[PDB]
Design a protein around this ligand. Structure first.
Ligand SMILES: [K+]
Ligand SMILES: [K+]
Ligand SMILES: [K+]
Ligand SMILES: [K+]
Lengths: 495, 495, 495, 497
């Protein structure tokens, strides 16, 4: 295990690449322009990252399309693509410490979570998708004797992937895994708030055996290079994870361009329902606190709306606050630190604005609620719990994407479900009960892509992850993730 | 068995409904306004059809939402939904001749086609989807022993369906089948060029046992009621079959509204590739003629591009011309007629304008090329073949949606594949050969949702139907059609 | 609704067929020998049933083999087999009253059960299998580009089915459904204790459209005609439902002959586990009584072992005794009878022998325990409950196949599981509890093909049915039953 | 650069320390009786090691151990991802000991060292790896039930699995079974053939080193009529899987009926037809494949192309190509990497092959290649690749499995007769068709009653292809995800809500 002093030492002795990666080579943007990569830890300078635009996107697509048509990857044997992506995953573990440090410095996540959660799950996501390549079987229909009906899946071609900043490496690997496994060419557009991890792994892919031009990274802003890719006439599929606002615009961009397939993972207001007959209220309390404090509340499936039955609310709420004592906002370079820094100033101001909206809506602040650690020159906010919150208030409707918890009461099982579904979102939800019938009937009633019973943030690579309604469409992880990067073909042969 | 005089007699004594169908009852538009429905058979009047608008759509959505929330259909047992849908299918067969007569008068296709193909296939489409309901299994993931990972599917809720005019009944049932089977509430919006059969079957559904509000029909215009459904914040999913322009516009409406799931099926320029070593050149010639003449060429997967190998072009071309003679444009109410009228004047003018474009591109007219049966008062056109066509010409790249064929020569298998894939479309393709390797390798190389080998227009309800690229997304028929009306939920239960 | 007088009248005026059905025709045994088919209702004579032997098996197989090779049914289109088997199902319903009467007269079960349960389920079982034929897809493997790898299923050919007497018609259709659907020829050997219904539906099959020789019925003894089919060198597959002892002999016969596939469904000693925290204790008691009294306890999945927790046993037992009083043995031809007669004298003596064994083991007779209705000439035994039973006693370990209940108690969940799995059988089990974790963890711990939570005798045609250990191998119902009558073929094609 | 020679492999043979004890409960041990048998080599007749000769007492002890390990849940209730990771390490360990395992193979049963290393060990490792990777990719079912009801259809390990593996592919066949069986969480007792026990004895230790708990994977060397019979008759063995002859396979099925009605999955003999049409894409390639289909692994392959069905119109031009191609397959020292054809497993097998060759002459068939014992002066058992011409499908050498490099050439007039001749057999394990015609390739393939049909190639299919026979060639399938079904039970859990 590395010491805090070791991480800071390596942070100084760290050479960072900021160039784009096209056709197996690192290069600058066509304009040569660049934005500064700032660290939210202490406002330090990390590197100067290439700022791509339309010209870079046009070049990357041609390279991606040519690589796809060549067949170097798209028509490579399934078992061989599997072995290549496994080496890709293995290389992520070999360079785990650097990747973890890059991410922590990039967006502020505690170094322990960058190494043991981010990097570890990222390599697993690539490996699992690789292992699944030659385990998938296509279909043969029941036809008359003198006829053969084949139903097969083929790679779409050129795939554009726009990755957020909360889990830059992990979300990249959730997209890269199945997309590369199916044999597509990928153009990765990382978030401008965290481009370092995407830039680094692009070289690792080529070292693993991924042919030139199959995996490309175009750093920059969403309104520039991101918009260019979404509007490009030769991009077949665009996958995205982020806000509902941006996701809506990307779908419009598709309707204005080439009718490209769009698969979106928007935001969410995931309810965490706690009944009176919960097996362990303490465990549920620790979970409810962790569901809003982990990754500084910067999680799409954060347990923002904590629903508690009136029978236990007076006992349960003190346990949540007591459990939240352990989630300290500290130095992201310290392994012992539970909660790190927010991504940037704008994010903090937004979170603090919602905290301000919390008071103005008439909510009773019972924990935190203020900016912390300003002396570091960093961006930090302490975990926050608002009591007496109804589902009509602003802080209950809108997604804060910060460590702010709304506690809501319900009378019975019917109301809890009514409140939980009272949202345009539907990414996740949780149920805490020891009753067999109620657990299942509630989970079925909830309109969410992921329902966790007697736990929060469950499910591994075998669990399809996505949302209902405005939380997005399509699924990441599992075998269902492959469907987003493939086209069905019905080959009917007359014998 | 019925003669020409029989169908013309029934057409004069036919009482046609023109109202919308909302919540189990027929009703005029909220504005009371209507539009005239004319017959392209001879320009006769049929009935006044309700012209719905935003208000009507607003009412139907709440009706559909309430029906879905009640659970009268959405939470009915799968086996019971099966029985009802089968009863629905049977009712189409009992009213087969009326539905066939309505279809023929509405949009012009021959009566024998309406009865023996359209009505039969539509009923089969409903029955097949019904039979499939309780045969589909969801998933249980491989999890640790102290955990249960359920992966299930649930109906999306309210489903809007915009249906084309070329196959009004059949395309409606391709949507209605899987949409109703999954337990969703459906709001059908038929084409203004052919609203009758959609209006009629709405009554048959409730007679079969479909609860009120589950299946609603709103006739009208795309920019009014269609636009309203596409922009409604409470519509979960939109399905569509039509033009690329409209399909692209619908996707924008979703991005502007509630980010609703959109499944589109656009046009196509399907290449019909005939090699020298085809098993039977005569049979391929018959299929080549039929691939452009059937349903007046108003077919999405019409063989509008006949790709012939150069070494057999001089022998195969006359065979196609001779075979095309068998398809005579005539009185659609005559059982012997195999080529009916075009849907309306504007469609005829579009076809005629493309024939003019054929001459101006330098192509050699070798069959048809003129408007026919003008004295009847209906819009008709001769099946048309152009020779000496290159894939760069206007008639070879743009969809005509008429019986206009483009004959293009190729040298070898590599050129054929290149010419075939050189199109923004990708809905269907066909290969004619007796060689094992060449048949399979070509079929794999074609970018089309359906590849027919040694036959044309193949595949039944077991064959998924849809497009690559700008021919659309998602699949009709097969079990895959059900996935367009369901949402995946990952329920991970801690034990 | 027919009355007791109606059924008794139809019984006396019923003409019964007792010949075998080979190659589409009724005919006597080759030796001309017959056996007397008597009714357990009152000992009356019903018909002289053909007593087939080796020579009849040899002829039937040749007929079945020729029918399979002709491809009239085996190579008929999947959708055509579906439509025919659906007509088969309809013919069972059109002859429901006749079939129900035969069943009741043949083996003694209540007329209401034969009609509203047995016939209705038999027809549904056939219908469900038929609907499933063209819903099943075979597989295409993930192979290198220059290769096509198909994984398909083909009918085995000649299938021999030996069915029991407890559910003569239903068990027949459980085999017939998937066997005929997949295209096989079937030779059905009904139990000599209940041959009538099998003989009847054979004619119904050919009326529906089943080709001659595809479905044959050979009535007779197990040691004569059953042994001949099991030893026949041209029978591809043998399916069976009955006792463990007979199932073992058949597996030996196969090993001595042509190594034919053997799928067995032997006996069971199903534990019905009732926890203290069951949702409805009244419903649990009502179900427990029905689990041993329904069909005269002649059910392989009968709850012959009732497991009650100590903290509720003294309160739960009188509820079971009271519930059992509703199940009164009586005239099977009376619509209001819920408990009929045992199949014959041998079965009655066997059941009575185990009741005496219960006394010998030291158990306490707390309900029933005697033969009844001896004056009628039939064989009846009243529902019997033994209390104070340990899992070492004879009546707890050996299958009785009568309405005899053994009540065993346990301290905790661990002991319940240990006692439940302490048996050479593993066909079914039930768990009654309201706790989420306890329900699932117990169900996963029980070694039974079927596990019913908070209910008994659950699962429709979607649920596979079979046993662990000595309860047999393979599954009936669901889509898994199809695999017992098909062979896998891997066709690897080099392109 | 470096290159292993014949002398290098021979020197490795004299250095090699060979383990011969049984492996029960994570430890090596003798048989309870202490009896052993002499493991000899068909390479030159040399002594290899004294291998434990187990019996009833050892089978009883191994089952109890296997049962206890299963019930403990140390492996059976371990997470799928963790079972996956353990078996990958197991697969990696086979690769890290590839040279030793391959040498053990060659010395034991006589196949060429280049085959043992590049084919057997490599495939066996990949088979374990593939089955491991597939563990958490498989999904159980949820049925379409009424709303207030939940219907789960799940799979669970059977418990104790006895595996009886043949001698022709000792390591590979072992891993075809061990892969899916251990992946599903079962305890396995492996009984290797008495003609080749060494590799099974070896890998047992490697499983333990990889993380497989004690008693989960046991190895009992000995005879089939003793310990093999004991496992088949045991009342606590849940499942018996087997690959070998039709006669023994039938016998095991009897033992199951006589004991506890244990599930029995078998892969018996075969007489696979290799069908070559006039319109074959490449006659030269088909001729090379035909020769290889009978010479590879000394013809001791279940799916060997023992029947060559040739269309009459090309018989006179196809046969000389096959005879020429057969010359490339020369019997030689198995320890020489250049050798492509090794030795037969023992003297008994050699005599049987020689007996069938004599029967070929007696049936009236014409000898056109090989037909004699060779390399007799080496002290080893070798037989030349043999081709008989003018064979009918009624002759003894055409209907009976030879399990040696003896090919039967049979003529047919057309596709209809070809299918008839090809199906005229009690077996149905494999078949091949060579044609360039689309319709004829598919229709013939569909008409052939065989578990594996290869078109325009021979011995095709990787781990994604199910492998097993029709009729008397056995039941069930090895490889693919279908293999897992032989080691699991279906459970329908219907929960009323
Ligand atoms: K940054
Ligand atoms: K019209
Ligand atoms: K009887
Ligand atoms: K040996």
């Amino acid at each position: 295990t590395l010491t805090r002093a070791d991480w800071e030492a390596r942070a100084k002795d760290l050479k960072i690449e900021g160039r784009a990666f096209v056709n197996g080579e690192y290069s600058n943007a066509a304009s040569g322009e660049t934005f500064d990569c700032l660290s939210p830890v202490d406002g330090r300078f990390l590197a100067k990252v290439a700022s791509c635009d339309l010209a870079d996107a046009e070049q990357a697509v041609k390279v991606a399309r040519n690589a796809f048509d060549s067949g170097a990857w798209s028509r490579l044997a399934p078992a061989k693509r599997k072995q290549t992506m496994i080496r890709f995953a293995d290389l992520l573990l070999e360079n785990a410490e650097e990747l973890a440090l890059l991410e922590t410095l990039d967006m502020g996540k505690p170094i322990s979570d960058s190494l043991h959660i981010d990097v570890a799950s990222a390599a697993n996501s690539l490996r699992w998708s690789a292992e699944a390549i030659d385990k998938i079987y296509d279909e043969v229909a029941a036809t008359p004797h003198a006829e053969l009906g084949l139903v097969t899946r083929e790679p779409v071609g050129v795939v554009a992937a726009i990755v957020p900043w909360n889990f830059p490496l992990l979300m990249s690997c959730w997209k890269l895994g199945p997309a590369l496994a199916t044999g597509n060419s990928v153009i990765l557009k990382p978030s401008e708030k965290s481009p370092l991890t995407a830039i680094r792994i692009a070289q690792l892919a080529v070292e693993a055996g991924i042919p030139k031009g199959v995996f490309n990274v175009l750093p920059g802003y969403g309104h520039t290079v991101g918009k260019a890719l979404a509007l490009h006439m030769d991009v077949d599929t665009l996958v995205f994870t982020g806000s509902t606002k941006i996701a809506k615009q990307l779908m419009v961009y598709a309707g204005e361009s080439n009718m490209k397939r769009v698969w979106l993972e928007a935001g969410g207001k995931s309810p965490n329902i706690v009944f009176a007959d919960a097996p362990d209220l303490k465990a549920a309390a620790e979970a409810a606190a962790g569901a809003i404090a982990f990754n500084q509340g910067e999680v799409c499936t954060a347990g923002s709306r904590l629903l508690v039955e009136r029978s236990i609310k007076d006992k349960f709420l003190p346990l949540v606050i007591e459990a939240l004592k352990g989630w300290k906002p500290g130095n992201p370079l310290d392994p012992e630190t539970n909660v790190g820094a927010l991504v940037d100033t704008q994010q903090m101001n937004t979170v603090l604005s919602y905290i301000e909206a919390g008071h103005n809506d008439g909510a009773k602040l019972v924990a935190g609620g203020k900016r912390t650690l300003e002396e570091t020159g960093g961006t930090y906010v302490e975990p926050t719990i608002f009591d007496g919150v109804t589902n009509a208030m602003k802080i209950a409707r809108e997604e804060i994407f910060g460590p702010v918890l709304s506690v809501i009461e319900f009378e019975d099982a019917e109301e809890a479900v009514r409140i939980a579904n009272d949202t345009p979102y539907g990414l996740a939800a949780a149920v805490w009960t020891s009753n067999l019938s109620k657990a299942h009937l509630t989970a079925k009633a909830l309109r969410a892509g992921s329902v966790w019973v007697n736990q929060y943030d469950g499910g591994d690579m075998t669990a399809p992850f996505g949302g209902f309604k405005q939380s997005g469409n399509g699924r990441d992880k599992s075998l269902h993730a492959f469907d987003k990067y493939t086209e069905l073909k019905a080959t009917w042969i007359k014998l």
